[PDB]
Write a protein that binds this ligand. Sequence first.
Ligand SMILES: OC[C@H]1O[C@@H](O)[C@H](O)[C@@H](O)[C@@H]1O
Ligand SMILES: [Cl-]
Ligand SMILES: [Cl-]
Ligand code: NA
Length: 472
Amino acid sequence: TVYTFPDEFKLGAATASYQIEGAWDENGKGPNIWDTLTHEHPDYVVDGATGDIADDSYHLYKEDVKILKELGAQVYRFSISWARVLPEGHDNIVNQDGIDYYNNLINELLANGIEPMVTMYHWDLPQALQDLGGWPNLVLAKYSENYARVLFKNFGDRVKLWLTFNAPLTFMDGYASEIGMAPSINTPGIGDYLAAHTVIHAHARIYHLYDQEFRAEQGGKVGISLNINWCEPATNSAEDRASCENYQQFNLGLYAHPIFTEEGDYPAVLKDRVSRNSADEGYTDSRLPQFTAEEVEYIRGTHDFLGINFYTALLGKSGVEGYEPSRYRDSGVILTQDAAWPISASSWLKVVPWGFRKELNWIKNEYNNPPVFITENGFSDYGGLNDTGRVHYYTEHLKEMLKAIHEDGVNVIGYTAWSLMDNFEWLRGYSEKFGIYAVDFEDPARPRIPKESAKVLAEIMNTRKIPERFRD
Ligand SMILES: OC[C@H]1O[C@@H](O)[C@H](O)[C@@H](O)[C@@H]1O
Ligand SMILES: [Cl-]
Ligand SMILES: [Cl-]
Ligand code: NA
């Protein structure tokens, strides 16, 4: 039983637009902040890589569907490129080529018995909107509503699973470093909080839009994908436990407390620690933006499920470190990783499968057991088809998730592996491989070929259980 997937549980794989599509300026697509970063600042990216071609999924989407069908995916999670649909960011011009592209992909999936799950925003903001300040500027919440309306109108007759945003905890950091994630602006502890605030408002507008304009007709579900690491106390002390609770609230709770609790608003510890630190540094006003009571009520409850991107764990101990001002410093935890944990090709990603079960329980307890869809989970290496590390990563994480479901009563409803194929890994370029299919980026045809992990995942998807040879 503990090794079998529930009958209705959905298994599949995931990608994101900039990471796979290419065709960055083809057929009317406008520029986004990742076009800008990779073109203007190749020094920020391993190898000076760009997403100009990537997996060429703009042209090769039928090949993506073919490998999804081979894998036996029930669901394909992909994102829509805002600037491919609305090249100016604003909704005055809709690019028919972009509409056609996503319709073609959706229709191809459905014809092959694969359900589309669509992320509206996976980090590729139109440059025209960044030029207004991007996410720190609250005007983007209405712009995001208008973008979502175009998506619901054009695609919602066939798409029944939506994510407003992907991993805003990560993309907000594009406002916390001059050399980091797009748009690479150095406003740590100030602009990243403003970005989060706008994202939360935008998410809520999109959910209410669905309720008002689309749900009765379309009957789908709208969630948000939040990334979160487990944070294990470095020792069993109450002080180290407090630091790990701080971590959860400053990383997951920042987004999930406003949306997924009955109370709404930011977590108290976030409000209070930032208020205190801001006062002590001489600011008249807290660096953390505020919601009014009306906004708190508007935002809370704006969910049909919770998407989670889970990869790894950290150790947390009591204390404060980091630069003033910064979210890490504000969070009141000292973070490390255990040298004993298996490594990957990504400095931040260690293999800690039991952390997944701990995180799922933390979520269950904090948010009253929301339906949870694992929208990403996966592992990096530098190359190779005999990807034993990736196979082990998947089989262990899936076992831990199944324990969370069967032993712990966590309402996990689906899981999409990150990623269907090797792709553009942001500032790491093509150097870090997350795919279950390999892609030859030196071959203009970008063939996708299965790794051992794709074969094992296909076996899991076909049999709906963890094979005996991977059991404890
Ligand atoms: O870093 C690995 C992956 O983690 C995620 O949380 C992001 O959504 C992906 O775009 C990224 O490729
Ligand atoms: Cl101890
Ligand atoms: Cl066997
Ligand atoms: Na339209």
